[PDB]
């Protein structure tokens, strides 16, 4: 069973129903309503002053609504983080996702959020990445060298960094 995890996050898919999400996550880890509206928010392990977590958004409040948004913090680790200040400075607004990853390192990023506002169309898809230098990521505390890069329709709209090189 256990708490929310990276493995559960990866098994939960766009196009799933609320019940499918709950069955994978483990209902005891999850909440809806209140601060989370009609989304499902599931806690992982303690981290900092909150928890690692996932939040799944749906096409509507209806029982048959489907996942159109996946967000997480501290459920996923970068596979080979190689970001630096110099590499971050090479990233430019207007770059495609592929250009960005080639600049910051292919293993440097994890997906913070991904949303299809016109689901099942991909039009206007938004993507938010967190990218990390070699020791920047932490699953339990605070980052020590990171960047936030965000996209609409696969094109970079903005970038910010903290603590690089």
């Amino acid at each position: 069973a256990g708490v929310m995890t990276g493995a559960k996050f990866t098994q939960i898919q766009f196009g799933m129903t609320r019940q499918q999400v709950l069955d994978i996550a483990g209902a005891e880890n999850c909440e809806t309503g209140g601060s989370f509206g009609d989304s499902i928010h599931c806690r992982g392990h303690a981290a900092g002053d909150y928890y690692a977590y996932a939040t799944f958004g749906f096409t509507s409040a209806a029982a048959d609504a489907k996942v159109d948004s996946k967000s997480q913090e501290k459920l996923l680790a970068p596979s080979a983080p190689t970001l630096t200040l110099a590499k971050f400075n090479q990233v430019t607004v207007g770059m495609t996702r592929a250009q960005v990853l080639a600049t910051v390192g292919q293993g440097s990023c994890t997906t913070w959020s991904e949303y299809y506002p016109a689901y099942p169309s991909t039009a206007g898809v938004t993507l938010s990445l967190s990218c990390f230098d070699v020791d920047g990521y932490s699953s339990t505390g605070f980052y020590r060298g990171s960047a936030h890069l965000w996209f609409t329709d696969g094109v970079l709209q903005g970038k910010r960094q903290w603590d690089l090189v």
């Binding site: 601060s35 989370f36 509206g37 900092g48 903005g158």
Partner: protein
């Protein structure tokens, strides 16, 4: 079993860290127990009670409304932002932002609120206005949690924080409605389970706000008391320890437990 100061000395020895603590009578403001009360500690998310105090002061003055909707953008989102990230498309009201900042330690929520009071400098000016000449906010989330050793940025002292909380919650400075709202957000804190709440006896009142930082920094500010009525302010901060999160939490809970066991002794 140990007396509060005995438990603190045990905790510092076990953590190789530095604890700051004040226990203050809520009605009178008298200091009942103190340790390192004039040393600086990083506030971490405990600053958010002061922040929402400043927001409510603007509400009282007719310069803000809790119902006012704030719209924001990806650029505004930093780490540890579960509620504000969920509401990205539609925005949040000022009151919803204070609820998220206080009850869930939502960092982007706190940044959005900070902008409304003039940023860290504006919040520090508010502190000076209410007669706190010690506490200071210098940075935004999430940098304010860095807890570099000897860094005065984003710090308070246990004595100053206790006095400031008493001022915000009980003095004439905020309206009755605003004092009730700030206390309610603290009552509804969701992330403080492992701390004083874990050792709070059945039937007692608690309202609190926690914080976590780098380099072992951890803290709690609380109002608590028997018979479901607030009686005392307790502030406990920890800094400069390599201990795990579990150990830090257990030690703060143990100091709270000593204060509770020796409540009338």
């Amino acid at each position: 079993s140990p007396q509060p100061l005995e438990q603190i000395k045990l905790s510092e020895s076990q953590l190789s860290g530095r604890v700051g603590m004040i226990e203050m009578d809520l009605a009178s403001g008298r200091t009942l127990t103190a340790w390192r009360a004039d040393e600086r500690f990083p506030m971490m998310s405990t600053f958010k009670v002061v922040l929402c105090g400043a927001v409510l002061a603007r509400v009282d003055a007719g310069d803000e409304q809790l119902e006012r909707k704030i719209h924001y953008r990806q650029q505004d989102l930093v780490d540890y932002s579960p509620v504000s990230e969920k509401h990205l498309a539609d925005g949040m009201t000022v009151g919803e932002l204070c609820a998220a900042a206080i009850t869930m330690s939502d960092n982007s929520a706190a940044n959005l609120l900070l902008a409304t009071v003039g940023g860290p400098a504006g919040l520090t000016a508010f502190l000076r206005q209410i007669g706190d000449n010690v506490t200071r906010l210098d940075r935004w989330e999430t940098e304010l949690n860095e807890a570099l050793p000897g860094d005065a940025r984003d710090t308070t002292t246990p004595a100053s924080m206790a006095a400031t909380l008493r001022k915000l919650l009980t003095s004439q400075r905020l309206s009755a409605r605003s004092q009730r709202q700030l206390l309610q957000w603290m009552v509804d804190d969701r992330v403080a389970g492992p701390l004083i709440r874990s050792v709070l006896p059945a039937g007692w009142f608690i309202a609190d706000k926690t914080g976590a930082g780098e380099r072992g920094a951890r803290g709690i500010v609380a109002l608590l008391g028997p018979n479901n009525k607030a009686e005392r302010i307790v502030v406990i901060y920890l800094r400069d320890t390599p201990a795990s999160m579990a150990e830090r939490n257990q030690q703060i809970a143990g100091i709270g437990a000593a204060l509770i066991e020796h409540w009338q002794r």
